[PDB]
Amino acid sequence: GVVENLASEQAARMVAMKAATDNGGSLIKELQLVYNKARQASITQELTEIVSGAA
Amino acid sequence: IIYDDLSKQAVAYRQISLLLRRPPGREAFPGDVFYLHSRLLERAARVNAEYVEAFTKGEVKGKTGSLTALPIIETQAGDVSAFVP
Amino acid sequence: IIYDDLSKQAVAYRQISLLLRRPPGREAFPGDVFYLHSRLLERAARVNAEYVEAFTKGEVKGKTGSLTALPIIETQAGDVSAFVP
Amino acid sequence: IIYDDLSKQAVAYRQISLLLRRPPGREAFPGDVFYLHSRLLERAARVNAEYVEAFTKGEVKGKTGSLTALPIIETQAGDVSAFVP
Amino acid sequence: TGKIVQVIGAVVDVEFPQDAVPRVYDALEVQNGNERLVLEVQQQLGGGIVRTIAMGSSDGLRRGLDVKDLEHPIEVPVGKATLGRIMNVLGEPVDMKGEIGEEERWAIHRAAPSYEELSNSQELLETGIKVIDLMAPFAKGGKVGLFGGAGVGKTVNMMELIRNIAIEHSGYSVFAGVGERTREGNDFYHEMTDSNVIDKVSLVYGQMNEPPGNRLRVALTGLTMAEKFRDEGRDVLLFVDNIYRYTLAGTEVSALLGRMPSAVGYQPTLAEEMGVLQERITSTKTGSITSVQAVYVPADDLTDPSPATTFAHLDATVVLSRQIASLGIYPAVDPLDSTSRQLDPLVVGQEHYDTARGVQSILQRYQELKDIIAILGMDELSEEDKLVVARARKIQRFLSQPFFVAEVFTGSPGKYVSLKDTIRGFKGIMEGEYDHLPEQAFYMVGSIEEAVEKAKKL
Amino acid sequence: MATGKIVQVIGAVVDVEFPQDAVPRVYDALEVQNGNERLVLEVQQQLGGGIVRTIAMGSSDGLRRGLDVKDLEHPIEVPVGKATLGRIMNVLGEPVDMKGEIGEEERWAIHRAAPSYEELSNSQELLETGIKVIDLMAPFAKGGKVGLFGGAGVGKTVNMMELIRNIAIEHSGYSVFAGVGERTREGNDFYHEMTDSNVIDKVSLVYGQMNEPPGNRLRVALTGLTMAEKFRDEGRDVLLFVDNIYRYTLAGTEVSALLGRMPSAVGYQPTLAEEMGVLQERITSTKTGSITSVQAVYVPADDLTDPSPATTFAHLDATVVLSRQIASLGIYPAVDPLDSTSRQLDPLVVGQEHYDTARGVQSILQRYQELKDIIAILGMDELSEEDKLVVARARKIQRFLSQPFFVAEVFTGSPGKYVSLKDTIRGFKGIMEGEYDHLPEQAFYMVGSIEEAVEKAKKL
Amino acid sequence: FRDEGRDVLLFVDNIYRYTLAGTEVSALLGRMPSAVGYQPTLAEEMGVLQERITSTKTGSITSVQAVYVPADDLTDPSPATTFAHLDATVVLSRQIASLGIYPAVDPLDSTSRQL
Ligand SMILES: Nc1ncnc2c1ncn2[C@@H]1O[C@H](COP(=O)(O)OP(=O)(O)OP(=O)(O)O)[C@@H](O)[C@H]1O
Ligand SMILES: Nc1ncnc2c1ncn2[C@@H]1O[C@H](COP(=O)(O)OP(=O)(O)O)[C@@H](O)[C@H]1O
Numbered sequence A: 001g002v003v004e005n006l007a008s009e010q011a012a013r014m015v016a017m018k019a020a021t022d023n024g025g026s027l028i029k030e031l032q033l034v035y036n037k038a039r040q041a042s043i044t045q046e047l048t049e050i051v052s053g054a055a
Numbered sequence B, C, D: 001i002i003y004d005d006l007s008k009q010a011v012a013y014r015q016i017s018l019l020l021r022r023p024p025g026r027e028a029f030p031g032d033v034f035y036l037h038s039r040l041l042e043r044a045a046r047v048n049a050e051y052v053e054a055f056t057k058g059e060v061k062g063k064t065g066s067l068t069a070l071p072i073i074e075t076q077a078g079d080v081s082a083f084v085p
Numbered sequence E: 001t002g003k004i005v006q007v008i009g010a011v012v013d014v015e016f017p018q019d020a021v022p023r024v025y026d027a028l029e030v031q032n033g034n035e036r037l038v039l040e041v042q043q044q045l046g047g048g049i050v051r052t053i054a055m056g057s058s059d060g061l062r063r064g065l066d067v068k069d070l071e072h073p074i075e076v077p078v079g080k081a082t083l084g085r086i087m088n089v090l091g092e093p094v095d096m097k098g099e100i101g102e103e104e105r106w107a108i109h110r111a112a113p114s115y116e117e118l119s120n121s122q123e124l125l126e127t128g129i130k131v132i133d134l135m136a137p138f139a140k141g142g143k144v145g146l147f148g149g150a151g152v153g154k155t156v157n158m159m160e161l162i163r164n165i166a167i168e169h170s171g172y173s174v175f176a177g178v179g180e181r182t183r184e185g186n187d188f189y190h191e192m193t194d195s196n197v198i199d200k201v202s203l204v205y206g207q208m209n210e211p212p213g214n215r216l217r218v219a220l221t222g223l224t225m226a227e228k229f230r231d232e233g234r235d236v237l238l239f240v241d242n243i244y245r246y247t248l249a250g251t252e253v254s255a256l257l258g259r260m261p262s263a264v265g266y267q268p269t270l271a272e273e274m275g276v277l278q279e280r281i282t283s284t285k286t287g288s289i290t291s292v293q294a295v296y297v298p299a300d301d302l303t304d305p306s307p308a309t310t311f312a313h314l315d316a317t318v319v320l321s322r323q324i325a326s327l328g329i330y331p332a333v334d335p336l337d338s339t340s341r342q343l344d345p346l347v348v349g350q351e352h353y354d355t356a357r358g359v360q361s362i363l364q365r366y367q368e369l370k371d372i373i374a375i376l377g378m379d380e381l382s383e384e385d386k387l388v389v390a391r392a393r394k395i396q397r398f399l400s401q402p403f404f405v406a407e408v409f410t411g412s413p414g415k416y417v418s419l420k421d422t423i424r425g426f427k428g429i430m431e432g433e434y435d436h437l438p439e440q441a442f443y444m445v446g447s448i449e450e451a452v453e454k455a456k457k458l
Numbered sequence F: 001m002a003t004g005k006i007v008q009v010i011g012a013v014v015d016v017e018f019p020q021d022a023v024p025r026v027y028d029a030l031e032v033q034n035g036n037e038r039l040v041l042e043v044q045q046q047l048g049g050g051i052v053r054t055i056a057m058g059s060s061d062g063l064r065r066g067l068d069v070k071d072l073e074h075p076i077e078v079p080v081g082k083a084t085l086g087r088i089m090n091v092l093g094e095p096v097d098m099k100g101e102i103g104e105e106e107r108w109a110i111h112r113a114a115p116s117y118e119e120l121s122n123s124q125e126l127l128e129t130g131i132k133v134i135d136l137m138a139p140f141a142k143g144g145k146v147g148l149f150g151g152a153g154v155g156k157t158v159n160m161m162e163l164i165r166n167i168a169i170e171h172s173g174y175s176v177f178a179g180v181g182e183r184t185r186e187g188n189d190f191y192h193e194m195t196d197s198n199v200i201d202k203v204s205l206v207y208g209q210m211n212e213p214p215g216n217r218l219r220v221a222l223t224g225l226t227m228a229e230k231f232r233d234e235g236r237d238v239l240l241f242v243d244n245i246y247r248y249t250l251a252g253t254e255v256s257a258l259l260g261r262m263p264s265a266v267g268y269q270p271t272l273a274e275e276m277g278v279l280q281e282r283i284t285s286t287k288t289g290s291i292t293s294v295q296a297v298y299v300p301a302d303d304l305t306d307p308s309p310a311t312t313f314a315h316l317d318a319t320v321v322l323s324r325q326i327a328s329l330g331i332y333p334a335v336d337p338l339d340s341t342s343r344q345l346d347p348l349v350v351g352q353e354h355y356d357t358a359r360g361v362q363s364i365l366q367r368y369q370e371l372k373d374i375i376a377i378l379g380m381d382e383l384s385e386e387d388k389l390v391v392a393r394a395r396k397i398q399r400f401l402s403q404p405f406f407v408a409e410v411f412t413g414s415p416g417k418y419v420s421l422k423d424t425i426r427g428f429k430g431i432m433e434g435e436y437d438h439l440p441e442q443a444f445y446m447v448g449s450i451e452e453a454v455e456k457a458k459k460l
Numbered sequence G: 001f002r003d004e005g006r007d008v009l010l011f012v013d014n015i016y017r018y019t020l021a022g023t024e025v026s027a028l029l030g031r032m033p034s035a036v037g038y039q040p041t042l043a044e045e046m047g048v049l050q051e052r053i054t055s056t057k058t059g060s061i062t063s064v065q066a067v068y069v070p071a072d073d074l075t076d077p078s079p080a081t082t083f084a085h086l087d088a089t090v091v092l093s094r095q096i097a098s099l100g101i102y103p104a105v106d107p108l109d110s111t112s113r114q115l
C-alpha cells in the first residue's frame, strides 16, 4: 500500500505541475499585452508634453 | 448600411486633424473623435409615420421608414478597452 | 494648520498658469510649482525666544512659538511618482 | 577605433538641436538622429586593393585597408528598445 | 449691428462697435439661411471682437453676416408649465405639442447657494437593490454617482432607481438627457406616458446628434428648472443622463477658444467648469434636491482626470466593473470600490455597518488569494483559506439581482428586496448558516428564502 | 536658365524662392550646383510668397544662401526596362557600380497613381513558386504582398535567390530588389553572391545605403517600384523585393519630423497609413500583368500592436516564418509550416483538395509537436500504435518538406529540383493516405517529388 | 582652500536641487524642453559644476554628495547623468529601508573605483 501510494504521489505531482506550467504561460501573455499598452502610452504622453512645450 | 473599418475613418480624420495642428487628446486622437462617429451612426433610426408624412409632403402615408447600420471596428490583441472601441 | 488637498491648490495654479500662456512643464504643470509649495510649507517653523522678543518688542519674553503644518495629498493609484506628490 | 558613449554624443547633439530651435522627435531627439550615427558608423569599412591603389595614386598596390569600430552604448534598465540603442 | 469675422468649427467671432460690445454670456442672434441661430458670448477679445459658441449647426455661415445683440443671457421657461413636456437647450418645446405656457424665464447661468443656506440631512433612502443600499446607501437630498465604462449598466441601474424612488417619492422630478442616445430618450418618454407618470416629470434633451454648444449648455438648463422647483420649497429628484458629456463638450471647444491644452489634452478649466455646475446641485434649508448621475469612464480608466475630479463632488459613488459584468453578475457593482458617506455606525446603526465591513473584508481577502490560486490552484490553500473562498464566491453571487427593466433582457421576473432581508442574508452567509448550499443557489435570487428554494432544485 | 534662389538651409531642409508666376509643383525636382557637383532637391510644400520647401537628395554641406536653382518641371525620373537588369543604381537612377552609363530607352517619374478599379484584374491566381513548403502551406497570389519574418542564419537570402531564379527561368518574369536602408557591406556581399549564382542578369538592384540622407532612403522604394511597373507594362509577371519595409516607415517618420509636422501615436508621422497605402496599392495584378512582392518585416519591440506592424499586416496576404530550430535539423528551406500562413489557403481560392491536404499536414505536425512532449516526459512505451503511426508519418512529412535549390548546389552538391503544385499536393496527399508508408524516412529527405522518393528508396 | 595647498572636505546637501532650479528657470529663459521635462542643457550644467570638484597636484578636495533619486527611479536623467562623475557610489534603496534595516545600503548596486 505504501509503495502504490508513492507512485500515486509522483503521478499527481506531474499532473499538477503540468497544469501550473500552462497557467503561467497564460499569465505571461496577459501581462505582456498590458506592458505593451503601458509602453506605447508613456511614449505618446511625453511626446505630447514635449511638442506642446514648443510655445 | 455597412461601414467597413470606422477605425480607418478615425485614422484618416486624425491625419486631417494633426495636419491642422489641432491639439491631440487621448492616444493621438482629437477630442472631436467622439462627435465624428456619433453624428454618423445617430442618423440610423426608425422614424414614425408622422415624420414620413411630414417629409414626403403627404405623398406617403402610414409607413415607418428605417435605416439599420452595421459599423465594423478592429481591436488590437482583442483589447476591447481601447479608446476608439 | 491643516492644508486640505494641496494638490487642488496645484491644479488651480496650473489653470492660472495655462490661462496666462506660461510654458507648460512636466505633466502640464508650470515649473515653479515646487517653489509654490516649498515657500508655503517652509513657513511652518519653531522660532527661538529671541525672535519672539524682537517681534513683540519685549512684551513677550522667554517663550518659543511654533506652527505645525499637516498637508494632505491625494495619489491616483498609489503612484507616488506624479509631479506634485 | 573605439567611440566611448555614443549615447553622450547623441545627448550633445540633442542639446545643440534644441538650442537651435529645430523640431523635436521622440524623446526630444531631432529627426535626423539616426543619420548622425549611421553616417558615423558606415565609415568603418574594409576597402579593396583597387580603391587603395587609386587613392594613393599607385604608391601602394597590393594592400587592402580597414577601419574597425567598437561603439559603446549604455542602456538604462536593460531597455534595449530605447531610441538611440 | 455686429459682423461675423471668423467661423472655426463651432466657434464664431463677431465684431461690434466699441461702445456697444456685448457682455460675457450674452445671447446673440444671426439668420442662417432659412433659420435663426443663437450664439452665446464666451470671451471678449480686444478691439470690439467677441468670441462666441453657436447653439446650432454653424455650417452655411458666411463672414460678413449681420448679427443682432440680444440684451440678456439664455433664458428658459421654469415652473409647473414645463412639467410633462420635452424642451431643448434654448428652452424651446421639442414635443409636437403647442407653446409652453410659461409665466417666468430664468437665466441658466446662476450662482450657487451660500454656505449659510446649506442644510444637512441623514434620512436614509431605501432602494430595491441589495448591493447599493448594503454597500453604499444614500440619504434624501444627497448626490449619487454611477461610475462605469461603456456598456456596463449605468442606464439600467438609473432606470431601476427611477422606478423605485421616483414612484414611491411623491414630488416633481427633472430628467436631463446630456449627450446620450436619442432612442433611449424616446423609449423613456413613452414608458412615462403609458404609465401616466409623465405629468410629474420635466424632460430636457441634449442628445449626441446635437452640435457641441447644445451638449455644453443643456445640463445648466436642467439645473435651472430643478432650482426653480427647489426654491419653491419642494423636494425634487434630478437625474442626469451622462455628466461626462458636459466635460467632453468643453474639451471639444476649448482648443478653438485658444486655450492651451492640459493633462491628457483636457481644457485647463476642467475642475472649475465641473465645480460650478456641480455646486448648484445642492439641497437647501428651503428645499431639497436628490440627484442620481451617470458618469462615463473613458477607456475604463478610473484615474483619468474627469472621473477623478468627479469623485470629490459626490456623496455616494457606485463603481461598475467590466470584469464583473463579463461574468454576467448584474448589477455589476464593485463592492471594494463603491463607497458612501452614509456607511457610518451612527446613521446606519451597528448591524448594518458590521455586515458591510465583514463583506468588504472577506472580498478583500479573496482578492489577496486569487494570485496564489491562479498559479498553484486552490488545492494548495489552507483549509481556512478554502472556507474564505467558498464564502466569498457565495457573497459575489448573492449580490446579483433580477431587475424589472431587466425582465426583457433576462426573461425572469424582477425582485424588490427590503434592507432587513439583505442584512439578514449576508450575515447568515458570513456566519456559515448556508455553507451547505451550492453557489448556483445564490445567483440571481431576490432573497435568501429564494436561495434555499433554488437550492432544493439546484 | 535657373530661376530660383536658396533662402534657407537648415540641415537637410532647403527653402527656395521663385518668381510669383513660376512656383514648382509639389513632388517636382530641382537641382543646384553644390560647388563642383549637382544636388537634387524634391519639393514637399509650397509656402506663400513664391517660397517652396524641399528635402535635399544628397549632402547639404557647402550650400550657400543665394545659389541659383534650376526648376526641372517633372518629378524625379529614373531609367527603366531591360537596360536596368544586372545594374546597381541609387535613388536617382544613377549607376552606383562602376560599369558605365545605363543604356536607357525611357525615364519614368517615380510618383504615380495606383491602377484604377477598371484596370484591376478580374481573377485570383496563384503564383507557382516551385517550392514545396511555400506552394503548399503559404501559397502566393499574383499581386500579393508576402512578409518574411525570419531572423539571421535562416537562409533568407538564398530563398530570395531561389525565387528570383525560378521566376526568371520557370516563368518568364524579372525581379527588382529595393535595398531600403541597406548595410553597405551586406549590399556588396549580396551583389557578389548573385554574381556567383549567375542570377544577377535576371534582377535589377536599386540600393539606398544607410549613410544616405533620409529622403534618399524614403524614395528608393518608389524608384524600385517604378522599374517593376515598367516590367509589368511589358506584360510580364514580376517580383519586387523590399529589404525592410520598417525602414521605409522610419524614413517617413524622419522626413516628417524634419518638416516639423505634428507627430502621432507612438511618435510616428500622421501620414503613416497613407504612405503605406501609397506604396502597397501600386503592387497589384493588372489585367496587363502583376507585381508580386516579398517584404522583410521587423517588429519594433516584438510588439505586434505597434503602429508599424499593425499598418503593415493589413496589407500582407501571406506570412513566411524562417526558424533556426528547423535549420538545426538540416532541413532546407527552413520554413516553419505551422507558423507560416496564407489567406489564399481557402477552398474557394485554392480548391478543396489543396485545402484538405494543407489542413491535414498542419494537424499532423501539430499532433507530432504534442506527442514529442509525451516522448520526452514519459517515453516511447507510453505511445500507442496509432500514435506511433502519426509520429512515423510526421517524420516523413517533415522531411518531404525539404528541397534542393538550384542556387544551393555548391552546398548540397546535388542538382536542384522544381516541383509543380499538383505534384506536391499529390505527394503529401499520398503520404497522408498511407501509401508510401513503407519507405524509409530518409527516402524523402531532399529528394524532390514523390516519384523520385520511390527511386531513392530503391537504392537507399 | 585647495589653491592654498590645503586638503579640504566638501559636503553637498543635495546636488539634485541645483538641476531642479535650472529646470525651473529654463522654461522662462525660452528654451524648448527635452526628455522628462528637463532642460536641454542638463548634462552641460552638471558637467560644468562637477568638473571643478577635483584634486589637483597642489591640493586635494574630498567630497561627499547626496543625490536625490526621484521616486527611486535610477533611470531618471538627473541621477543617471550624475553617476558618471563620481568615484564611489552608494545606493540607498527603499526596498531595504522598508524592512527598517538601516544603513539600507544595497551591496548589489553600490560600487567603487578603489575596489
Ligand atoms: N441588471 C441587468 N441585468 C441584465 N442585463 C443587464 C443589466 N444591466 C445591464 N445589462 C446589460 O447591459 C447592457 C447595457 O446596459 P446599459 O445601457 O445600462 O449600459 P451603460 O453602462 O449605461 O452604457 P452606455 O455607456 O453605452 O450608455 C443592457 O442592454 C443589458 O444587455
Ligand atoms: N538548399 C540548401 N541546401 C543546403 N544548405 C542551405 C540550403 N539553403 C540554405 N542553406 C544554408 O544557408 C546558410 C546561410 O544562410 P544565408 O541565407 O546565407 O544567411 P543570411 O540570412 O545571412 O543570408 C548556409 O550555411 C547554407 O548551408
Ligand SMILES: [Mg+2]
Residues within 6 Å of the ligand: E153, E154, E155, E156
Ligand atoms: Mg448607458
